[PDB]
Design an enzyme around this catalytic site. Structure first.
Site, mmCIF file in Angstrom:
data_model
loop_
_atom_site.group_PDB
_atom_site.id
_atom_site.type_symbol
_atom_site.label_atom_id
_atom_site.label_comp_id
_atom_site.label_asym_id
_atom_site.label_seq_id
_atom_site.Cartn_x
_atom_site.Cartn_y
_atom_site.Cartn_z
ATOM 1 N N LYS A 1 -17.775 37.000 -69.873
ATOM 2 C CA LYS A 1 -17.749 36.655 -71.279
ATOM 3 C C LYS A 1 -18.600 37.664 -72.290
ATOM 4 C CE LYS A 1 -17.622 32.787 -74.329
ATOM 5 N NZ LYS A 1 -18.639 33.361 -75.203
ATOM 6 N N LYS B 1 -11.555 30.522 -66.418
ATOM 7 C CA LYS B 1 -10.656 30.897 -65.639
ATOM 8 C C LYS B 1 -11.049 31.871 -64.352
ATOM 9 C CE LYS B 1 -6.249 30.199 -67.804
ATOM 10 N NZ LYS B 1 -6.706 29.271 -68.874
ATOM 11 N N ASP C 1 8.391 56.057 -66.744
ATOM 12 C CA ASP C 1 9.460 56.584 -67.100
ATOM 13 C C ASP C 1 9.438 58.023 -67.967
ATOM 14 O OD1 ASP C 1 8.488 56.424 -69.510
ATOM 15 O OD2 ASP C 1 9.703 55.218 -70.583
HETATM 16 MN MN LIG Z 1 9.062 54.906 -72.948
HETATM 17 MN MN LIG Z 2 6.504 56.402 -70.410
HETATM 18 NA NA NA Z 3 -16.617 38.202 -75.024
#
Ligand SMILES: [Mn+2]
Ligand SMILES: [Mn+2]
Ligand code: NA
Ligand SMILES: [Mn+2]
Ligand code: NA
Ligand code: NA
Length: 324
Positions: free
Chosen positions: A51, A63, A181
């Site tokens: 936090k 969580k 990619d």
């Molecule tokens: Mn890309």
């Molecule tokens: Mn890329």
């Molecule tokens: Na924070």
DNA sequence: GTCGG
DNA sequence: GCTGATGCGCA
DNA sequence: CCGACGGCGCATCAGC
């Protein structure tokens, strides 16, 4: 991966928010928390510890407490169990199917790769390509193959015109060992922010790369942006098909372009927010002085990457130090 | 969901 | 047939 | 409590 268990959790939550809930700001809120926690140089012992980090709030701290205690999150177990949620999540892994198409498909009983290939007629061109190369597009590209790809792109571009400059940016430029990619920035002396737009500048490069069978499919193509598929030449094992983006930008904006497309994603988010936190609206095309009233001046002159950093008083960071 | 109005 | 509306992917 | 959180190039297609 000091905190890989928590970052994985936050990323799955981010994905659900974007793909299922179509709550894009929560999606970004989760990715922002995951980024700040992945940069945190200690192992997180509690929610309260996390936090303290900007981007991590009450709900995420809780969580984090649960995951730390139980090694899982109830909310994600439920989501994973839910048929609609699960299937929608999954379909969005196909390039061309976003949250809307995914939901529509699922509402019609179309929810698997198999369903998709059984219904090609309900797929557009881009989604068919996405389906066709589903597995391939989920593979990483090893740097060794990126270097090979680099050579071919630079060399075929030269063949069209000796004065084009093609630069591979993105994770490659940062010096990553695998890339998702290939992103190519293209320039030519005849195209500047003033110019006149003589067409086919990009088309000539795409056509040629198609000619040597390097580019194999087109997802989208216009006068400034190409999105498609490519494949290194191979009785030996065929290489996987890969995603390639080519962007043609005005030459006088090369450095803002390279800076941006060298990334990262969150890093450029980080860059723009802090930019305005010093009187500048840095974007992908220019850096301009901003204005309290809302006026951003003309683009300051930029002749290097560093030139941009100076303006904004950030410690210079090499391509490598920009993952976020 | 988070953080600064 | 056309185009305004929307979806998609994206550092 | 509340609202900002970045924006754009390109493709498709419902509703005329
Ligand atoms: Mn890309
Ligand atoms: Mn890329
Ligand atoms: Na924070
Ligand atoms: Mn239109
Ligand atoms: Na939202
Ligand atoms: Na997708």
């Amino acid at each position: 991966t000091l905190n890989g268990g928590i970052t994985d959790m936050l990323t799955e939550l981010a994905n659900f928010e974007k793909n299922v809930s179509q709550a894009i700001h929560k999606y970004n809120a989760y990715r922002k928390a995951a980024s700040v926690i992945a940069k945190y140089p200690h192992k997180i012992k509690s929610g309260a510890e996390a936090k303290k980090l900007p981007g991590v709030g009450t709900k995420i701290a809780e969580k984090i407490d649960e995951f730390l205690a139980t090694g899982k999150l109830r909310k994600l177990e439920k989501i994973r169990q839910d048929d609609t949620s699960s299937s929608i999540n999954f379909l969005t892994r196909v390039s061309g199917i976003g949250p809307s198409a995914a939901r529509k498909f699922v509402d019609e009983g179309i929810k698997t790769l198999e369903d998709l290939r059984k219904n090609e007629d309900k797929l557009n061109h881009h989604q068919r390509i996405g389906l066709k190369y589903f597995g391939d597009f989920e593979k990483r590209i090893p740097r060794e193959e990126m270097l090979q790809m680099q050579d071919i792109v630079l060399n075929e571009v030269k063949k069209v015109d000796s004065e084009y400059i093609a630069t591979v940016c993105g994770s490659f430029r940062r010096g990553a060992e695998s890339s998702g990619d290939m992103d190519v920035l293209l320039t030519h002396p005849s195209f500047t922010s003033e110019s006149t737009k003589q067409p086919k500048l990009l088309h000539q490069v795409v056509e040629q790369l198609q000619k040597v069978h390097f580019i194999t499919d087109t997802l989208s193509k216009g006068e400034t942006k190409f999105m498609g598929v490519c494949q290194l030449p191979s009785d030996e094992k065929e290489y996987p098909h890969r995603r390639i983006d080519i962007r043609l930008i005005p030459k006088d904006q090369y450095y803002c372009g390279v800076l941006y497309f060298t990334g990262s994603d969150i890093f450029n988010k980080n860059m723009r927010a802090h930019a305005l936190e010093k009187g500048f609206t840095i974007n992908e095309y220019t850096i301009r002085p901003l204005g309290v009233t809302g006026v951003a001046g003309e683009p300051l002159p930029v002749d290097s990457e560093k030139d941009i950093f100076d303006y904004i008083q950030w410690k210079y960071r090499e391509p490598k130090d920009r993952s976020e």
